[PDB]
Amino acid sequence: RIIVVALYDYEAIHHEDLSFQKGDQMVVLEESGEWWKARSLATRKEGYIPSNYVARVDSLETEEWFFKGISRKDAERQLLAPGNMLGSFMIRDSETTKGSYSLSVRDYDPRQGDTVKHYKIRSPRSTFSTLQELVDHYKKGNDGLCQKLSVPCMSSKPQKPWEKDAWEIPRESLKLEKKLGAGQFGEVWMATYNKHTKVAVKTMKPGSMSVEAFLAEANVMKTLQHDKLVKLHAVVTKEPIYIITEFMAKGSLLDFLKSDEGSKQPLPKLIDFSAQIAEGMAFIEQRNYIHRDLRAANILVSASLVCKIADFGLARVIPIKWTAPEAINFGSFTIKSDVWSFGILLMEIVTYGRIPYPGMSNPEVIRALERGYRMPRPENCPEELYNIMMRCWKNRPEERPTFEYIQSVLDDFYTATESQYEEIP
Ligand SMILES: Nc1ncnc2c1c(-c1ccc(NC(=O)Nc3ccccc3)cc1)cn2C1CCCC1
Ligand SMILES: [Ca+2]
Ligand SMILES: [Cl-]
């Protein structure tokens, strides 16, 4: 008889799902993925609950200061997001000591700025019974920490999982309310699914993109979910093909960088964007795929300033200034040619969306590349960041770095390796 408890309030929006409040417990009846059949103990109603909204009772996730499955850098990102302050903290699974837990605390530093310090856990000069007591002490005066614990890190509701068994949907479920962009193969619309969920919808123009073959690839992309790739929610099988993805409130990185909220983003933020994108490419790199069209226009920014690679699968169904010479001349697109593109993307970001090689036509650009030309360095781009672009722009593909390496460098750009975790007496 399994029992769970609710971490956040939830309003039912479908037919068979339950409403529940933060703290309500319920008996688990069926475990079938993102949705669980359960029986609320507060209402006695049976129905479906989003499985990521609940945790086993008396387990660590029930605590407001615990954060399951969070990397050191994610913890750094979450702690630095608005709503937090000096002393804000969390306890999470250690990324390196795979089985133990670490502490992450927010600090201010007059030179650097707002920072996040990480402390490993099991100082020998302190024995607390379990993790709760540990928290309890450091809240009243630091026992060595660079700052003393104030409040747990702000946490917001997870994204609602898509409706169960609603991968193939009828067109009737959608109201496409606003055309966001048009192009060669169709349009992208801001839409509403069953009057309750805001989504984005890619409407396809039919071509050699064979129906039952286009849908084959979309099914592939649906297996390749990652936090840094845009969620594939649903599909409409009948021509013209509709692709339903999650809505990204701030649109393209290109447009967002050109905006006024964009022109306020400091360099550490721009690099953070780059790090997110490289994490997405690193996932793709690991799975042995290729994006083939990496650039700022194909990156989406969420409302919370999270950057995701806008899929990516469009090359499995169908701009040389972003393209490596090897793929331009012989059509040899690889993960290494994306690296080149990423380097160009990197320049876009630092230049707030300024078009690459400004003032040069395509052939101008190509012959310049063969000469050995590369874009110069903007009067705000760091030498060490520029050096990364150059390494991406190596003429021989095999000498360009991996995304795995690129991600690790951008992630800790301002942090010496020796300074990742603090070390206490
Ligand atoms: N999701 C969004 N949310 C908010 N705004 C969005 C978008 C998108 C958007 C961009 C790319 C896609 N691509 C996509 O779904 N590709 C795909 C997925 C599976 C199989 C084949 C292709 C979908 C929506 C585009 N846009 C705006 C429209 C033009 C600029 C940004
Ligand atoms: Ca140290
Ligand atoms: Cl019961």
Side-chain angles (χ1 to χ4, degrees), residues 1-315 319-425:
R1 183 176 153 93
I2 335 169
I3 304 274
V4 297
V5 65
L7 315 168
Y8 330 83
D9 295 341
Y10 175 89
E11 275 196 355
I13 60 163
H14 310 100
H15 286 134
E16 296 171 308
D17 59 325
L18 306 184
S19 289
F20 54 79
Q21 259 179 312
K22 192 182 184 187
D24 294 351
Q25 311 161 33
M26 42 189 58
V27 184
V28 172
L29 296 173
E30 276 177 49
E31 297 164 3
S32 33
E34 312 199 71
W35 289 95
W36 281 3
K37 192 175 185 180
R39 174 191 311 129
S40 167
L41 298 178
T43 69
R44 312 297 306 170
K45 307 179 180 187
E46 299 180 351
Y48 293 92
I49 58 170
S51 66
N52 53 293
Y53 265 63
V54 299
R56 293 194 170 210
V57 188
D58 297 337
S59 102
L60 279 162
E61 327 191 19
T62 64
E63 310 284 7
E64 312 278 327
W65 42 253
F66 191 72
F67 286 75
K68 187 196 181 314
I70 290 312
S71 74
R72 173 173 58 86
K73 188 67 182 180
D74 281 331
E76 181 182 308
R77 290 196 177 98
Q78 282 212 38
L79 274 170
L80 290 178
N84 305 275
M85 61 181 189
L86 254 322
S88 293
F89 71 102
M90 78 172 65
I91 294 183
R92 55 180 172 82
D93 306 340
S94 246
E95 185 176 349
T96 54
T97 322
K98 259 306 178 185
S100 197
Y101 311 136
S102 301
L103 178 71
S104 298
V105 194
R106 173 156 169 161
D107 181 27
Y108 193 86
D109 178 76
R111 291 184 140 198
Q112 302 178 72
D114 274 279
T115 60
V116 171
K117 308 288 182 52
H118 306 275
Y119 303 81
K120 284 248 179 180
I121 287 172
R122 305 183 189 187
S123 62
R125 33 179 300 261
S126 233
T127 289
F128 305 102
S129 181
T130 32
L131 318 191
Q132 264 279 23
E133 291 189 359
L134 196 162
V135 177
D136 305 333
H137 177 218
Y138 293 99
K139 303 186 66 178
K140 301 200 65 184
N142 41 336
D143 199 47
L145 318 179
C146 76
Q147 205 77 10
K148 114 208 176 78
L149 304 187
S150 80
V151 307
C153 184
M154 295 312 296
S155 187
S156 60
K157 298 189 187 78
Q159 187 172 8
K160 297 201 174 192
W162 192 250
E163 174 185 321
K164 177 172 179 289
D165 292 298
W167 167 246
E168 286 186 347
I169 64 175
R171 215 181 303 277
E172 286 64 44
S173 54
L174 296 168
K175 294 185 176 182
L176 308 215
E177 312 178 338
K178 178 74 181 175
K179 185 164 60 174
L180 298 172
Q184 208 153 331
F185 308 102
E187 306 156 316
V188 173
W189 288 73
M190 173 199 302
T192 284
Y193 175 82
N194 287 330
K195 292 75 195 159
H196 55 59
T197 295
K198 172 137 83 143
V199 295
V201 179
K202 198 155 183 148
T203 65
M204 295 300 177
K205 268 211 67 170
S208 52
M209 310 81 226
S210 162
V211 245
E212 297 87 19
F214 189 100
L215 310 169
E217 312 301 315
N219 201 49
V220 169
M221 294 295 112
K222 182 50 186 163
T223 80
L224 301 183
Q225 320 171 45
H226 185 270
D227 184 48
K228 292 309 183 304
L229 308 196
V230 180
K231 261 278 196 234
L232 256 289
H233 280 324
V235 86
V236 175
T237 38
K238 164 189 189 60
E239 268 187 6
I241 302 304
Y242 285 12
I243 297 298
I244 293 87
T245 77
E246 57 176 321
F247 186 77
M248 301 290 283
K250 260 104 175 193
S252 83
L253 179 61
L254 184 54
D255 292 328
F256 170 79
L257 285 176
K258 293 174 152 301
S259 90
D260 252 273
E261 189 177 13
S263 65
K264 291 184 184 178
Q265 303 307 305
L267 195 55
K269 242 305 171 190
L270 301 185
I271 287 174
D272 193 48
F273 291 162
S274 309
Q276 299 187 32
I277 296 162
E279 186 190 354
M281 294 307 299
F283 169 74
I284 296 186
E285 188 174 67
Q286 171 66 22
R287 294 301 208 99
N288 260 271
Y289 288 80
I290 291 163
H291 189 291
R292 200 173 313 211
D293 195 39
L294 233 205
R295 52 201 203 90
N298 292 337
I299 306 294
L300 295 176
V301 190
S302 79
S304 53
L305 300 184
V306 167
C307 291
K308 306 193 187 192
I309 301 180
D311 307 53
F312 154 67
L314 200 77
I320 49 82
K321 276 192 177 183
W322 280 267
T323 319
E326 12 127 8
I328 289 176
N329 305 138
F330 314 95
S332 52
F333 294 88
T334 53
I335 196 75
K336 290 303 178 181
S337 46
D338 282 333
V339 171
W340 182 290
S341 311
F342 177 82
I344 307 287
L345 167 53
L346 200 52
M347 179 66 76
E348 287 195 71
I349 292 178
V350 176
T351 57
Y352 288 89
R354 181 210 83 193
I355 130 107
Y357 311 86
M360 308 177 55
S361 64
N362 298 18
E364 271 175 282
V365 160
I366 303 178
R367 305 186 307 265
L369 279 194
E370 192 65 278
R371 290 197 282 97
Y373 179 88
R374 301 291 189 266
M375 228 171 314
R377 186 183 66 95
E379 296 169 42
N380 70 310
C381 179
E383 272 296 335
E384 303 89 349
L385 176 53
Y386 180 68
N387 182 64
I388 294 180
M389 308 181 189
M390 295 297 305
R391 285 191 61 178
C392 295
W393 299 334
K394 247 51 177 66
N395 218 84
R396 288 179 295 189
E398 57 280 7
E399 279 165 7
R400 303 159 185 165
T402 66
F403 280 114
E404 179 181 30
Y405 172 82
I406 291 186
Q407 189 215 320
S408 63
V409 180
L410 297 181
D411 267 341
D412 287 315
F413 199 72
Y414 298 98
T415 299
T417 303
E418 194 261 343
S419 290
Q420 287 163 5
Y421 288 80
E422 303 275 299
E423 270 166 10
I424 226 57

